[PDB]
């Protein structure tokens, strides 16, 4: 009757849900829990070649086992009969990312793991989000496209004006290997102070860190839709502020193919996926929808 | 004993609270209500040289944790706010700020030339809006550092008095540093208001499957609880980088504890937008009481005992 299936990148995903990179995906036990859950997919922690605080309305963070570990997991330890796997990489240079992609390529070809390239980590000492520098963004994507023979996706930071949406999309549309865009990473460099101690709540970088959870939901929907509109030849994955199936429904209406869950999954654990699928199917049932293809991107004007 | 007084800009303010520009400050009745309130100050709606009727409605919507707006600069025009400052405002009640938001550097310079004698005679204080996120086809001016410098140079040439700037949020230290470096080169910039709304969010209603505000495909500026950690970050980042300037905090204030944290991050004044839209001007009685409660539990007698004194871990 109804289905949450999503048929993309050549795979049938059972439902659109997965963890957000960095949440519940660092240890063998966590990857196993994600694999055993009802999520449609899972992604690893952003890795490099070789901290968190719960807030009333979400989270702030300033946060790997190395690329070797997550490659070996993708190569020999992940059960692909359960669900597909994504791997996130966030090298410190175009070259570091490229050397990783060259080593990832035989594993992607043989097992099917899919690369998400992180251009938006807001916590790299002395180095702003890569995708806030459009010249650097273009060099990274050219370097990866030359080094990596396979399709990949990009994790984007939020933008806040149409001139930036336009410029980012114009660059991404020049790279046909970029088959998906994940909107969004955390809202960078927020600051939380505790009233009683009069002190910041995370230690690095004078307390500044990336925001997730309820704080980011309208920004996340805006970025999903902005890129859905400007990159019709690519898929958009939504990430940001998802706590319920209604939240996921709104991300799909904005354009999302997959829906990633970060802060809410950190708080609730992998059982959240059982609740999210039920809730989303319930919204669909009330509206008579039978498939996500019927309303993905179909947000209406007022 | 305890006190919320602020002594800045050659004025004495009874407490740090004021409305945020654009909230409860467009008509004479709203301005009189703000003046009759217990707020420490007030600011007018950002104005353009001529009156504007604004974007089509609905252009504001109440969210679970705040607001979204595409107001589109509806305002009675500069001549109306100038007349308010020159002839109607009771300065014995509290100091007044005037917000201006012309569509180019030259429009703002022309308004400043006419404002200058009124500022001199009456003492109204200029806040220049460099961050409106709802101008058709033109991004936040302060997201274009070359344009920002041009605006500050044009105003500085045209306007003899010190003034403040309403800034959009930034999200990385490279931008904090670039913005600060520019502001520190303009001696007439005496205060920096952090922040305007987080631009170009989007809200969709589950039932209608439609955007909830009409203009610009539903994209609009976010206020309220969504913006608080970003606001505090911006206040503190500029407080650290522009020690020669005052910082005014704006964003996410609903309680005296929220205000306390703005001040701890560096705020001299604290502006209230969405929460004031919702509660009305009695909010200022509650915010002062709550802020005094925080101070009493900590033994603070004056805001300078803790302003800017956020601690590391
Ligand atoms: C503790 C933590 C660690 C994260 N680590 C990563 C990471 O390694 N790579 C990445 O792309 N995003 C990382 N993120 C960002 C999330 O993937 C997600 O983009 C963000 O939290 C917004 O989603 P949410 O509102 O559901 O939390 C991290 C988020 C948190 C809270
Ligand atoms: C309806 C509305 C109208 C606004 N109009 C202006 C404006 O004219 N000038 C300006 O500088 N900011 C304007 N703003 C932004 C507010 O001054 C403020 O920066 C923002 O709402 C964040 O504060 P808050 O979290 O308390 O709402 C407006 C905000 C709202 C909600
Ligand atoms: C950035 C990050 C990249 C690689 C490794 C690591 O530990 C972190 C990261 C991000 O992308 N998003 C976020 O919210 N927090 C981070 O630390
Ligand atoms: C921007 C605005 C620009 C020009 C004139 C005017 O009256 C307002 C405005 C802003 O600064 N902040 C906000 O949240 N909404 C807007 O529409």
Author numbering:
A (entry chain A): 0 to 49, 58 to 70, 74 to 312
B (entry chain B): 0 to 312
From the reporting publication:
We present the first covalent inhibitors of Leishmania braziliensis dihydroorotate dehydrogenase (LbDHODH), a key enzyme in pyrimidine biosynthesis with a reactive cysteine (Cys131) in its active site. Among its key enzymes, dihydroorotate dehydrogenase (DHODH) is a flavoenzyme that catalyzes the fourth step and serves as a rate-limiting factor in the de novo pyrimidine biosynthesis of parasites. It facilitates the stereospecific oxidation of the (S)-dihydroorotate (DHO) isomer to orotate (ORO) via a ping-pong mechanism. Moreover, LbDHODH possesses a nucleophilic cysteine residue (Cys131) as its catalytic residue, whereas human DHODH (HsDHODH) features a serine (Ser215) at the equivalent position.
To elucidate the interaction of BARB derivatives with LbDHODH, compounds 2a, 2c, 2g, and 3c were cocrystallized with the enzyme under similar conditions as described for orotate. The crystal structures were determined by molecular replacement using 4WZH32 as the search model and refined to high resolution, 1.75 Å, 1.9 Å, 1.45 Å and 1.85 Å for 2a, 2c, 2g, and 3c, respectively, all with excellent geometric validation. LbDHODH-2a contains two FMN cofactors, two 2a molecules, four glycerol molecules, and 272 solvent sites; LbDHODH-2c includes two FMN cofactors, two 2c molecules, two glycerol molecules, three sulfate ions, and 148 solvent sites; LbDHODH-2g consists of two FMN cofactors, two 2g molecules, four glycerol molecules, and 457 solvent sites; and LbDHODH-3c features two FMN cofactors, two 3c molecules, one glycerol molecule, five sulfate ions, and 278 solvent sites. Due to the absence of clear electron density, the following fragments were omitted from the final models: in LbDHODH-2a, Ala50–Ala56 and Leu72 in chain A; in LbDHODH-2c, Arg51–Gly53 and Leu72 in chain A; in LbDHODH-2g, Leu51–Pro57 and Gly71–Pro73 in chain A; and in LbDHODH-3c, residues 131–138 in chain A and 134–138 in chain B. Additionally, for all complexes, the C-terminal residue Asp313 from both chains was excluded from the final model. Interestingly, the crystal structures of the LbDHODH complexes reveal well-defined electron density for the BARB core, confirming that it adopts the same hydrogen bonding network as orotate. In the crystal structures of LbDHODH in complex with 2a, 2c, and 2g, a continuous electron density is observed between the side-chain thiol of Cys131 and the exocyclic moiety of the inhibitors, indicating covalent bond formation. This covalent interaction induces the catalytic loop (residues 130–139) to adopt a closed conformation. In the LbDHODH-2a and -2g complexes, the side chain of the BARB derivative partially occupies the pocket normally occupied by the side chain of Leu72 (chain B), leading to the absence of electron density for the side chain of this residue and highlighting the conformational flexibility of this region. The cysteine residue in the covalent ligands 2a, 2c, and 2g adopts a conformation similar to that observed with orotate.
